[PDB]
Amino acid sequence: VKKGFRAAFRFQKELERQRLLRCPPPPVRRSEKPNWDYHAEIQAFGHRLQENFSLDLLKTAFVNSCYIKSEEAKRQQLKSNQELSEQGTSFSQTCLTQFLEDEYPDMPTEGIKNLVDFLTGEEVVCHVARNLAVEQLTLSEEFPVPPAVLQQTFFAVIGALLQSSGPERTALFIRDFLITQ
């Protein structure tokens, strides 16, 4: 028994690290960990992308309809997402067909439809919105945020930027995140 405390503390934490690598816990969503202020971080998501939102409208862009239903399942013991996502995916489909009809005039429109259904696919939009902190702000039922839900929240964020600041700034947004894919 070697007297002292610091080697036992360091060894105690390395044992904690091998406990975390041998049997890691299932990943918890970020709003259920320390250092979360939801409102401050929606505002940070606004200023991060270099645009302004009406913050309540972006807040409803992150609130799904599954979350309200399981939330009211939890009440017994909020505007949904679908309007903004409808407007956002209608707009982004027609503006992606604008860009891809302008810069590729010789394409068949079957090919423009398959390009646009790539740039609004679940693989692309789910790969984009996991690196723009959309997934951390999504109020969803289950974690990880399932890909149809997160596609819906991403186009809800496009709809909220549309009602915020018009069609030109969303056209620059869609240009800078969906077309660069």
Binding site: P34, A40, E41, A44, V128, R130, L132, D176, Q181
Partner: protein
Amino acid sequence: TARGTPSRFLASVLHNGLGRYVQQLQRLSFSVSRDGASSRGAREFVEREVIDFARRNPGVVIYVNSRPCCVPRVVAEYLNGAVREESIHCKSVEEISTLVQKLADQS
């Protein structure tokens, strides 16, 4: 060495310069002891430099936790979900400012 370490190819996160530039640093989490000689330079960093820093980039959300720590830490979280936990243990304010700007500038 290179054969013991993993390697990777040079990349960006979501084509980070093509359309626009996005600050890849989401959250900083300072934790600073109130009474404690290791977080002295953290204390004088919160008092002097963290508000100026928080205004020079508003897409970064900064949490100063200020608990009784025995080693102070900064925990940078990035947009692609990486976490860099670095210590600000026994550092001056200027060394902490170059460290925090180092974490801000990178991805």
